[PDB]
Design a protein around this ligand. Structure first.
Ligand code: GDD
Ligand code: GDD
Ligand code: MG
Ligand code: MG
Ligand code: ZN
Ligand code: ZN
Ligand code: ZN
Lengths: 375, 372
């Protein structure tokens, strides 16, 4: 895989936000004689594979068609560990286990499947002192974020060093394959243990674009509000397909809705933008790199209810508005746009996972790891 | 890449035609241990790439959009040589050379591009004593098959062992990438120098292909005297073959090109007629049909051609030296229901062509087929 090297990079405390890099060549082979281009970077196949041998890939699912979900699995590079974070109806779920069990047997590779609503998982989180996403039913709330939180735990428990997410509504297994290799690309290029790779692709769909352009703006306005100089650097406010080093995810709080992806950025700034005093010495001396990679394959998802467009505009502007770094002018610009689609709701934030006692969780799930695992 | 095992194989002379194989896992990583587990075939990445380093990938193009074309290019694995066989308007062709010169420069790889109406090529074919595809005007006729021919020549000259084709109208680089890897998968699975790989992806087009495959299966069954289900790639834009097999096959002009390939494999190597080719008689021919994970999504306009697809393919069969009265009739009934049938235009095998002559005749020119 060859990519553009980023022209400019946004320094913001110890955070480094790179501008969008295009993938030029999907598969650039096995190096042998290197040859140095300053303008782009060629990533060795072996190198990518080795990265993925340390990567977990999370496929979040709630009542997705089985054909699609198996399509997605077949696209994931062999080296990566598959975690299926499920929240489907019990019937559907048991079908998902069966599907994953067969795929993983046939392709001789380890996978993990678990259901968001497991009492054992709730029980485990309490034992680890992270009882924040547990609802009144006594069990973990519904939401994609909540599943991710659980997958992160599994990821941590499995000793994988990088985590990436991939939506299960993909029509194109080959686009999945590109996302996963792009994650690895980004982690190679990264020169810090703290790193995040966000993918973008460039009557109905035509309106999604004006929203993302406005979401992106809102975030650049935020950054500029601190910096004093205005920027266009962020192009990935929303990024369903994004990955981050495990060390970095345990460190970030995560919001709940369509606020999850944009809040990660807001959290990175608030934490490491060097406005507030920085606690973590390791982040202090390695810094953070955020990568924005633009993909060769068109994104094609299955949609079936698109009221959610207004909703995600709302969620992301809310984030920015409520950030501890938003200056009046930024808060105002965000108010006007919204009321232009008299009140602004605050996002729901779960504390960083670093807080969770892994040992306790581990103890909690002794008897059960058997059934999360598929051979 | 992990594939299913063909549930069954048609032996027809020294030809072996394998039943469709699904791709199960796009990228099966690096073997380091072993268990070819009864069910399936697992192909090492290293092996895949070593094959592709011997592969040319032809991309034919006639006024295709530049963005599409470059997308297709970005999808071709590094290891493969890119020949772009063009037949666009002369303005557009210059944009194409530009496009390719840039890509190949940036991604540090070699590529060839040629126009199908180049006088040097018509002249070179004549030098090699292959005057067959040259037109009235003194130039190689327009048509994809004519462009494919020219590519196979360039392929032969560049010393590559395998040629594959990829239509430039693809929306997905990843689909291209899967095609190219699947071609190498076939060539590895094969146990003979002479091997072919045919890709399929599973509204009016539906019936037509069902009926075209049926047409070949009836042809095949006609000779063996037992029915078969095996052909499912009667048409296959995206197909590859070992160069040794391609120089051995005659080629048809229309949409006829792909089906004829199979009709020709029967005629030549099914051993109804006597088989005179030491090497093919000793080694035999394997044909793979691989089913792809990625939906096919191309760009098309004014899709009338579905009918012309049917007529082309069923004509191939009708006029086979191996067609029986029954097949012939069956074929007529079908066409008639969409009183008189046309025989295809068939170019002789490229094996006859003198490359030494072509090499001589293309001296001062190779410089401009090759992009740095
Ligand atoms: N574990 C879990 N998974 C869920 C849940 N709800 C949905 N999912 C799964 O997670 C994905 C959510 O995708 P959609 O529900 O289709 O969301 P969207 O409207 O497509 O928005 C997506 O794309 C945006 C841009 O890429 C993202 O901003 C957003 O986060 C989401 O990924 C799907 O695979 C779905 O099956 C849940 O409560 N729990
Ligand atoms: N060199 C050359 N190329 C051509 C010519 N005409 C078309 N091409 C190029 O070769 C490919 C032919 O694609 P289409 O013209 O879209 O043909 P189609 O109707 O889409 O049918 C294709 O798919 C079928 C099944 O996959 C095939 O039956 C058929 O061969 C063809 O490849 C495209 O990249 C096109 O630009 C030509 O006269 N000369
Ligand atoms: Mg979706
Ligand atoms: Mg086409
Ligand atoms: Zn810039
Ligand atoms: Zn069969
Ligand atoms: Zn031999």
């Amino acid at each position: 895989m060859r990519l553009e090297i980023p022209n400019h990079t946004e320094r913001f405390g110890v955070v480094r936000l790179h501008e969008v890099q295009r993938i030029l060549e999907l598969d650039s082979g096995r190096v042998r004689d290197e040859s140095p281009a300053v303008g782009l970077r060629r990533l060795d196949d072996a190198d990518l594979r080795d990265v993925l041998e340390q990567t977990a890939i999370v496929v979040p699912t709630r009542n997705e068609r089985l054909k699609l979900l198996e399509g997605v699995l077949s696209g994931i590079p062999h080296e990566a560990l598959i975690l299926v974070a499920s929240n489907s109806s019990p019937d559907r779920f048991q079908m998902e286990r069966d599907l994953l069990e067969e795929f993983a047997h046939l392709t001789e590779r380890p996978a993990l499947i678990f259901h968001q609503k497991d009492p054992a998982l709730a029980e485990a989180l309490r034992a680890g002192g992270y009882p924040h996403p547990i609802g009144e039913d006594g069990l973990v709330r519904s939401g994609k974020a909540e599943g991710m939180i659980l997958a992160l735990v599994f990821a941590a428990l499995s000793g994988r060093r990088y985590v990436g997410f991939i939506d299960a509504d993909n029509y194109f297994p080959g686009a999945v394959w590109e996302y996963v290799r792009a994650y690895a690309a980004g982690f190679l290029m990264a020169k810090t243990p703290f790193a995040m790779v966000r993918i973008l692709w460039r009557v109905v769909f035509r309106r999604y674009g004006r929203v993302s352009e406005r979401n992106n703006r809102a975030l650049n306005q935020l950054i500029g509000g601190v910096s004093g100089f205005e920027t266009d650097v962020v192009k990935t406010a929303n990024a369903g397909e994004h990955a981050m080093s495990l060390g970095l995810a345990l460190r970030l709080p995560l919001a709940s809705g369509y606020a999850v992806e944009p809040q990660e950025l807001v959290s990175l700034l608030e934490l490491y933008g060097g406005v507030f005093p920085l606690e973590d010495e390791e982040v202090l001396q390695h810094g953070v790199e955020i990568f924005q990679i633009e993909t060769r394959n068109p994104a094609l998802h299955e949609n079936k209810g698109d009221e959610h467009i207004r909703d995600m505009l709302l969620a992301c502007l809310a984030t920015v508005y409520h950030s501890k770094l938003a200056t009046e002018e930024v808060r105002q610009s965000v108010l006007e746009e919204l009321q232009a689609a008299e009140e602004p709701p605050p996002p729901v934030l779960y504390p960083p996972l670093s807080s969770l006692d892994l040992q306790a969780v581990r103890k909690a799930l002794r008897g059960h790891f058997s059934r999360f695992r598929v051979p």
